[PDB]
């Protein structure tokens, strides 16, 4: 494995992550209806949790990516040439299957990267973050030169451009996958491991449960509904999440720097740090039910979501970096790998429970009346 092959493989993993998350990022950017995002998250978490316990073959990765590409093409075709009900039905079914396929593809890529020397998971993480920031930048460049037609509540040319970009990057990722990868071919009880690291599992659930309660739902979809936020400002508000979510994962990992020494602190302090995140719920509701100019401000709404995004990414990586420090009776290599599997399950369960908890806020008369 010389420098050329290492560079090619790292680029391939970056492209895998970017292409996998481009669909979710462009669904967020286009202000797609909330139920479609909910369906996508449900499919993603279900497929990921199922694929954790089942070793699906790694030859299916190009096929899953091609399925995602043809699903994006179907998005474009349905938006262009279909009626309202047909477009809605296709959107819901396609978003469910996209969530499932993306989860399976990410699981395959994780398995392929992990089972190697000089593990390549960090490159896929970088690819995911680059996908987020790249979709943000593309949205801002599109908003200048694209008319706001809003055929079915979604911009026409903006949707076309975003999905052709997704298809192009995904086909390039398929080419790299085919060229580079080779796709041919005593322990403590689970209850004992759960009892040791029950705080780490709990903290992973809490951070994801709260941030998916707010961001895609109450986050930018009830402020816009209430204050009539311009479509140009929505991409900035959504972008403050995707940019800061990625950039907050890194400082916890770089603890060898004097600046980031205190970014990984503890599990007991993490539990009370996730409780201070509960103060975001009053903040997000106030942005949607108060009228004076302070809350009707693009600057503080961007800050109100940058802080949520920064703490979301920061508190997702912390439990992984400290859980080994507090556990007592787990000492083998396999056990810690099993425990790390418990933590990623708490992430996906957190995403599923968080996204479906947004419907709790529908009961309260949060949004302002139209008059």
């Amino acid at each position, epitope marked *: 494995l010389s420098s050329k092959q290492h560079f090619m493989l790292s680029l391939t993993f970056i492209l895998i992550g970017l292409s996998s998350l481009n669909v979710w990022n462009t669904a967020l950017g286009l202000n797609i209806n909330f139920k479609y995002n909910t369906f996508q998250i449900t499919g993603l978490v279900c497929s990921s949790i199922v694929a954790l316990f089942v070793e699906i073959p790694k030859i299916m990765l190009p096929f899953l990516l091609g399925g995602l590409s043809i699903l994006c093409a179907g998005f474009q075709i349905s938006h262009s040439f279909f009626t309202d009900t047909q477009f809605d039905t296709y959107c819901l079914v396609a978003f469910i299957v996209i969530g499932v396929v993306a989860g399976l593809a990410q699981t395959i890529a994780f398995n392929i990267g992990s089972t190697m020397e000089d*593990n390549m998971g960090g490159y896929m993480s970088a690819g995911i*973050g680059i996908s987020g920031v790249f979709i943000f930048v593309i949205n801002l460049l599109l908003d200048q030169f694209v008319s706001p037609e809003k055929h079915y509540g979604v911009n026409k040319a903006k949707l076309l451009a975003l999905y052709i970009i997704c298809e192009l990057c995904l086909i390039l990722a398929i080419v790299f996958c085919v060229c580079n990868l080779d796709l041919t071919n005593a322990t403590l009880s689970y209850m004992e491991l759960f009892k040791d690291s029950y705080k780490a599992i709990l903290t992973m659930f809490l951070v994801n449960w709260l941030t998916l309660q707010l961001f895609p739902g109450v986050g930018h979809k009830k402020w816009q509904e209430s204050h009539n936020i311009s479509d140009y400002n929505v991409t900035i508000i959504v972008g403050m999440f995707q940019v800061f979510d990625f950039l907050s994962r890194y400082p916890p*990992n*770089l603890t060898h720097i004097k600046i980031f020494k205190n970014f990984t602190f503890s599990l007991n302090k993490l539990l009370v740090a996730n409780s201070l995140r509960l103060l975001f719920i009053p903040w997000f509701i106030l942005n949607a039910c108060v009228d004076h100019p302070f809350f009707k401000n693009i600057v503080q709404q961007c800050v109100c979501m940058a802080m949520l995004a920064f703490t979301n990414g920061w508190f997702n990586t912390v439990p992984f970096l400290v859980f*080994v*420090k507090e556990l007592k009776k787990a000492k083998k290599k396999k056990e810690i790998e099993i425990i790390s599997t418990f933590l990623v399950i708490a992430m996906f369960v957190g995403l599923f429970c968080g996204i479906w908890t947004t419907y709790i806020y529908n009961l309260f008369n949060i949004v302002l009346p139209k008059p």
Partner: nanobody
Amino acid sequence: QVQLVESGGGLVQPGGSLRLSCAASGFTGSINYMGWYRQAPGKQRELVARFSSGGSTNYADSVKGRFTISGDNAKNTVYLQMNSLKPEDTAVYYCNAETISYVYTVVFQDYWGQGTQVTVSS
């Protein structure tokens, strides 16, 4: 890059003692464990001692009650005071560091040091 620096190799009369010091520089991400794996001439690597970030110590029953592992976390340096030496402990000792990053997905990475020769004879 990640650099594992070791010190302590040498030749010792039987019944003597040594101190093996190991330090980690890059360790991108956290650091879960630091241990010593000895490889005898013409044999496979075998665990000798391991020290967790918290402080849990693993030992090999061959050196049980003889070698004592101490750790640090601010400097990520691990020391091994090895006592009551006998000729069958001659080997090359490899410092191993097991880490974890999870930027977006969990990764476990092991970094191995160059290894110090330890000989007991004469």
